[PDB]
Design a binder for this molecule. Structure first.
Ligand SMILES: [Ca+2]
Ligand SMILES: [Ca+2]
Ligand SMILES: [Ca+2]
Ligand SMILES: [Ca+2]
Ligand SMILES: [Ca+2]
Ligand SMILES: [Ca+2]
Ligand SMILES: [Ca+2]
Ligand SMILES: [Ca+2]
Ligand SMILES: [Ca+2]
Ligand SMILES: [Ca+2]
Ligand SMILES: [Ca+2]
Ligand SMILES: [Ca+2]
Ligand SMILES: [Ca+2]
Ligand SMILES: [Ca+2]
Lengths: 146, 146, 146, 146
């Protein structure tokens, strides 16, 4: 078997799986993490959501080549893209990572929802801090500027 | 159908479910949360683990009366009890909550693992901050004092 | 049987129903509307949603005293309060009507979501035009001003 | 499970449903719509009527392969065919769409009711604007011309 494993840089690499039905611990071990590190493993669902894989949660790999994000972290932050919830192990996320996670086309404009002022436009290299209180909400609009 | 829903106080209450296979959004709505709030929903597994329920993750309730923790939060912290990983939407957790989550008997002593000094004993009303870097590790030992 | 029937003013009045399971046509007729007028009938659900009642859709009134909004109109506009969708037969809606529909407490502030500028605060007597393109989104926050 | 989903073009396509009792949100998501878009979902009843499905209204799909019209819109217009009320998310509707919705045979003539002049005959490609005040009424007669 083969899986694709990435990190906060979202650069997937081939990892050999000897078990067709591994749990989170086996996926973490195959990615190069010791059992004590216990990294956060997020499986990419076909629809677009991210499913958290527990260290004892068995995943069936016989379906297709599934993708995982394995990042050594002790917490996860929740944000939303067009109302769809997504999970990120780090507190700082770039606009490029948001576009990759949300599968937002390059012909659209990414915005951060605000209430006290106009929605903030997020560039590819702009960094958004997820540690702020509340769930950060992101929006995709047509690439038009007034 | 009926489910039991609790919060950071871990006081479960009866909630009526009209759908036998609801997703996270339906469970949140039945608990009294508006769709924009998007609370964190954690299902209590029979073995003892906590499974995060996405807003679009369908849960089969026909098995038995399942228990959920529905807490309005934007993040989750990971800790461990005897090597078993657990998830908590809040950054401050009491020893009583840790005992309830880990099903630790009252005849055992709860400790917080440390490396630069002796492991810290956690009382029932003592508050542990999960916001510290790294995964906090908790240990259950025999109730003996030297 | 008895039902409560209101209009765009949301002033409910007692209406006598001779059938325990009437359809939309019977409810419209009992409210004083001729069959050719065919008014829009919206039943108030216990959770807070509004259910459109077709002229041939049977409603079971044996449960409790249900409430209806019967307004002679040829169209309905969709808006949202805290992510919950609501339906309104008129294109102009006041903030008081929005608070009544959403059951928003008087200790909270009502806002209209915007993208090119700060979210607009909606007063009780302020009129919002639902005829604008897109679904209008309303938000309830704590009554604090900077 | 499988459902058929169409749009204003009334060209139904197969959509896979993983839940036998989904709500409007799940049907919209399976059709390719983000949660923030919140499209209008209209279920085709066996008798011929169109039932509006709220984002939190559960639909039982175990009966048969049901058909839905999922159109991203913020409003719905009401018209009538032979006194039967129908709902349309768009303001412009062609005669072909009216015939498809009303199940009018090709051997009949479609007319638009008028009061100040003779009833207007509607061709297959003729466009009727539903935005006009009042409920537009359509009539099916024998295909005879004087
Ligand atoms: Ca295995
Ligand atoms: Ca999981
Ligand atoms: Ca805004
Ligand atoms: Ca946050
Ligand atoms: Ca999950
Ligand atoms: Ca130690
Ligand atoms: Ca920690
Ligand atoms: Ca009856
Ligand atoms: Ca209905
Ligand atoms: Ca509108
Ligand atoms: Ca269901
Ligand atoms: Ca409905
Ligand atoms: Ca006429
Ligand atoms: Ca009209």
């Amino acid at each position: 078997r083969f899986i694709e494993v990435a990190d906060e840089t979202l650069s997937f690499r081939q990892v050999v799986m000897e078990d067709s039905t591994p749990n989170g611990s086996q996926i973490s071990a195959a990615s190069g993490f010791k059992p004590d590190q216990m990294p956060v493993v997020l499986m990419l669902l076909p629809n677009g959501s991210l499913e958290d894989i527990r260290p004892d949660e068995v995943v069936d790999l016989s379906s297709e080549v599934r993708r995982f994000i394995v990042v050594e972290s002790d917490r996860t932050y929740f944000f939303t893209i067009d109302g769809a919830r997504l999970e990120w192990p780090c507190r700082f996320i770039t606009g490029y990572s948001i576009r990759q996670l949300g599968d937002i086309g390059d012909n659209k404009k990414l915005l951060l929802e605000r209430e006290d002022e106009a929605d903030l436009e997020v560039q590819n290299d702009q960094i958004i801090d997820l540690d702020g209180d509340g769930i950060e909400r992101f929006i995709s609009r047509k690439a038009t500027w007034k």
